[PDB]
């Protein structure tokens, strides 16, 4: 016997490939697991993993989000990478030029970028221009903006949101929710 101090035959809780069956994603992977192996470039190791990510961990990056990130100093002419899908945002007006490499573009977002004299690029196309990922801005969407997470941590005084199906007064708003009805949270 060994006085084990660690769970045996535990597996890293880490995805190894995508869970997808997309033949194309499977090639995008196959691509970047070559790059990630034969190049001492961090960027490839990031992209590779990123491809395995489920949809929830791939929240949409916005057009305005890229516009803002491009206002960083020293950033203006970098090519922004979004291992995921970019969506249009009517709220910006001025949109700059640059090139955006991402998994998918929405109609509106693809237009946006193009109209302003920019360019839309796939990941494998990004790969040829920047094998070592040079001059790139990797961007990520807001995960905790998901509506699912509002109900996370639901407990007394935790200030979170009740799994309710039909909001309004008469709906979980009396006893326990105000000083005048028993107590408050």
């Amino acid at each position: 016997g060994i006085d084990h101090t660690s769970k045996q035959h535990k597996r890293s809780g880490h995805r190894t490939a995508p869970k997808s069956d997309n033949v194309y994603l499977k090639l995008l992977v196959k691509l970047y697991t070559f790059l990630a192996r034969r190049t001492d470039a961090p960027f490839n190791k990031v992209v590779l993993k990123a491809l395995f990510l489920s949809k929830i961990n791939r929240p949409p990056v916005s057009v305005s989000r890229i516009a803002r990130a491009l206002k960083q100093e020293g950033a203006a002419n970098k090519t922004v990478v979004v291992v995921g899908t970019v969506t249009d945002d009517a709220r910006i007006f001025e949109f700059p030029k640059t090139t955006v490499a991402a998994l998918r573009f929405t109609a509106g977002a693809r237009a946006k970028i193009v109209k302003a004299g920019g360019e839309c690029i796939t990941l494998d196309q990004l790969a040829v221009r920047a094998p070592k990922g040079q001059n790139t801005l990797i961007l990520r969407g807001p995960r905790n903006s998901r509506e699912a997470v509002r109900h996370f941590g639901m407990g007394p005084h935790k200030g979170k949101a009740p799994r309710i199906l039909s909001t309004g007064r008469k709906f979980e708003r009396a006893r326990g929710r105000r000083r005048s009805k028993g107590f408050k949270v």
Binding site: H151, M154, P162, R163, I164, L165
Partner: protein
């Protein structure tokens, strides 16, 4: 019984509901009828417009 952090439901089936289930298998069929009924009308309505 009550348990876990779930939404409180309201599923009104405490009332012999299985005697009054309506399933529209005749969605297809009743459309054909509805069309046949339309054309055959329009016929004998001379050239008047339905």
């Amino acid at each position: 019984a009550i348990s876990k952090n779930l939404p409180i439901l309201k599923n009104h089936f405490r009332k012999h509901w299985q005697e009054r289930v309506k399933v529209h298998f005749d969605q297809a069929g009743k459309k054909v009828s509805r069309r046949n009924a339309r054309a055959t009308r329009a016929a004998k309505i001379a050239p008047r417009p339905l």
